[PDB]
Design a protein around this nucleic acid. Structure first.
Ligand SMILES: [Mg+2]
Ligand SMILES: [Mg+2]
Ligand SMILES: [Mg+2]
Ligand SMILES: [Mg+2]
Ligand SMILES: [Mg+2]
Ligand SMILES: [Mg+2]
Ligand SMILES: [Mg+2]
Ligand SMILES: [Mg+2]
Ligand SMILES: [Mg+2]
Ligand SMILES: [Mg+2]
Ligand code: NA
Lengths: 23, 53, 16, 52, 258
RNA sequence: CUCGGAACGUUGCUUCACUUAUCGAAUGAAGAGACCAAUGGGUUUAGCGUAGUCUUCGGGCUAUGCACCGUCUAGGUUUGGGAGUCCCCUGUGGGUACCCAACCGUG
């Protein structure tokens, strides 16, 4: 398991593919 | 998170309460060595894939 | 604390 | 054949036990520790009531 | 008929607390690890007055137990608290006025205030000006402490619940006659909209059970049942007795044989 | 028609002990409990036995022993062992006086 130094859980940052420019 | 707390609390409630034999029999599993041997035989006779068929 | 340790050791050598 | 014999030892031949055995009723580690400590505290608080 | 004033106040509306200019709720610090095992030493930085409260409030600065910062709690100051005083809070705090200790650590017969009804509730009993609780006895078998509340009732609480040594500051406030309606006006400015008070017999019967009649009178007994519905439950609610008390004031409130 | 008991099976209520439903508080859910050890757990790190009792003969079940899970500490007290005061001038600066075990204690 990991280690959490904060008393509440927050959403981890994940990979975010950027939106493509539409025609 | 709520789902994390609930899935841990679910295991606690399953162990604290009185489990009837119909459900309790599934906690008395086959031993590891026999389980590995059985799954090896199953893998040997696995069904053919879409390609091979 | 050092005084107690020395007294304990001195008593040890005195008793033995 | 060996696998059939092994699984029969655990499941088929033990049918009567499997049909009757209830599960659960397991205390937590903290509850088990608390019960053990309580028994130790009250270990010999009844020695004077024994005639022998 | 119409809704009685006592029922209307339940809606909130214009009868709510005048909370502006108040400094915030007054409480002990959080019952954290340091309090349960050691102690936390703070410094009284200011003694301040809050509108609608007779007791003085103390701003006490603590170091953060886990982070590089300060906390600055706000408590009800006991009588004798002064700026620069060191406040000790925890299991190992010494018995001195202004310190916060678990009740089980406080000797019987001591006078306490800011008493926690529940462990960690941060102080709910003996908070009004000049009030205090008296420690009657400790019972280690059940881990409880018996107290004499300011009203006279005796109450048992867990021994891990904390209390502050001393009496609440600002005592004797009710000893000075008001002498003027205007002084009451200023008194209630910081509390709520509940003054002046109109007698029920002076109202009309549409809005109050005591209203009406060709003489100002209550034509029925003013002692009403506990089970009376709102709008009918006015007067002396569920009174066990009436009239001038003679030969000793009994302790009021509900009867708890425990 | 009236009372005395089993010892089996089940239960109408109810004492006590318990904790997982539930309820009340508090907290940024910020340090719970144990290691100090069972009237615990374990064939998926548990194993070794013994005595009954079953077996579809593979192995279980009930007891009862042994071992494993399973580990450390501030401080307090007393038991063994080894092993390194000096510069500058009366004063100044630098430094050495330990380790383990047992009992209490519990973080
Ligand atoms: Mg309001
Ligand atoms: Mg009036
Ligand atoms: Mg009129
Ligand atoms: Mg009417
Ligand atoms: Mg009238
Ligand atoms: Mg009149
Ligand atoms: Mg009148
Ligand atoms: Mg919390
Ligand atoms: Mg602890
Ligand atoms: Mg110990
Ligand atoms: Na009349």
């Amino acid at each position: 398991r990991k280690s959490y130094t904060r008393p509440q859980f927050r959403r981890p940052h994940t990979y975010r593919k950027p939106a493509m420019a539409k025609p | 998170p709520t789902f994390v707390t609930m899935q841990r609390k679910k295991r606690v409630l399953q162990r604290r309460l009185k489990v009837p034999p119909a459900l309790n029999q599934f906690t008395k599993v086959l031993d590891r060595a026999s389980r590995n041997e059985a799954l090896k035989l199953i893998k040997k006779y696995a069904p053919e894939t879409r390609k091979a068929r | 604390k050092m005084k107690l340790s020395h007294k304990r050791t001195a008593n040890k050598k005195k008793s033995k | 054949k060996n696998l059939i014999r092994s699984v029969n030892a655990r499941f088929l031949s033990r049918s009567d036990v499997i049909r009757r055995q209830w599960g659960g009723l397991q205390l937590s580690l903290r509850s088990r520790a608390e019960l053990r400590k309580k028994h130790a505290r009250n270990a010999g608080v009844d020695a004077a009531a024994i005639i022998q | 008929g119409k809704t009685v004033l006592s029922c209307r106040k339940g809606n909130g509306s214009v009868y709510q607390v005048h909370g502006h200019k108040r400094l915030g709720p007054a409480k002990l610090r959080i019952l954290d690890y340091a309090e349960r095992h050691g102690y936390m030493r703070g410094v009284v930085k200011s003694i301040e007055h809050e509108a609608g409260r007779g007791a003085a409030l103390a701003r006490v600065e603590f170091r953060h137990p886990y982070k590089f910062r300060r906390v600055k709690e706000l408590m009800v100051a006991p009588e004798g608290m002064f700026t620069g005083q060191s406040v000790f809070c925890g299991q190992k705090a010494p018995l001195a006025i202004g310190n916060v200790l678990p009740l089980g650590q406080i000797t019987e017969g001591c006078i306490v205030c800011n008493v926690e009804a529940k462990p960690g509730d941060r102080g709910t009993l003996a908070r009004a000006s000049g009030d205090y609780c008296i420690i009657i006895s400790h019972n280690h078998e059940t881990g409880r402490t018996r107290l004499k509340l300011p009203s006279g009732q005796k109450k048992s609480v867990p021994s891990t619940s904390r209390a502050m040594i001393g009496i609440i500051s600002g005592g004797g406030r009710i000893e000075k006659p008001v002498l003027k309606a205007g002084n009451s006006f200023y008194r209630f400015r910081g509390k709520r909209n509940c003054w002046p008070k109109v007698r029920g017999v002076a109202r009309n019967p549409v809005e109050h059970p005591h209203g009406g009649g060709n003489h100002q009178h209550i034509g029925h007994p003013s002692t009403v049942s506990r089970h009376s519905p709102p709008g009918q439950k006015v007067g002396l609610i569920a009174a066990r007795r009436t009239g001038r008390i003679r030969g000793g004031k009994a302790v009021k409130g509900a009867w708890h044989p425990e």
